[PDB]
Amino acid sequence: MALKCFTRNGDDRTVTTCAEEQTRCLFVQLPYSEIQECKTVQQCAEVLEEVTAIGYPAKCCCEDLCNRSEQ
């Protein structure tokens, strides 16, 4: 029932609540900023690989605000 992870529109950090579809959370490491968004379990897994094949570390974990690491 609604996952709440950070979605970054530009550079802000806001707790957004996504639908049951996007029950996972996307977080990609960047040497400058970070990628943050809600993402459907499968989708986030598949997008995990697209970015992680480029060399950008990513995670799709399940928890509010879970899209984080170096906090």
Say which CATH superfamily domain 1-71 falls into: CD59 (2.10.60.10)
Whole-angstrom distance, CA of residue 28 vs CA of residue 51: 8
- Half-sphere exposure (Cβ direction) of 12: Cα atoms closer than 13 Å: 5
Q: What are the C-alpha distances in Å from 63 to residues 1, 22, 50, 54, 59?
A: 12, 12, 22, 26, 12
Task: Determine phi and psi for 38, rounding to 5 degrees.
Answer: -80, 145
Q: Quick one: tokens of 63?
A: 């928890």
Q: What residue segments make up the domains of the chain, in order of their start? A: 1-71
Whole-angstrom distance, CA of residue 5 vs CA of residue 23: 10
Answer for the pair 44, 37: CB distance below 8 angstroms, yes or no: no
Helix (H) or strand (E) holding 28: strand 24-29
Structure solved via = NMR
Q: Give me the amino acid identity at 57.
A: P
Q: Give me the amino acid identity at 38.
A: C
Whole-angstrom distance, CA of residue 26 vs CA of residue 32: 17
Q: Give every strand in the sheet of 58-61, ordered side by side.
A: 34-39, 24-29, 58-61
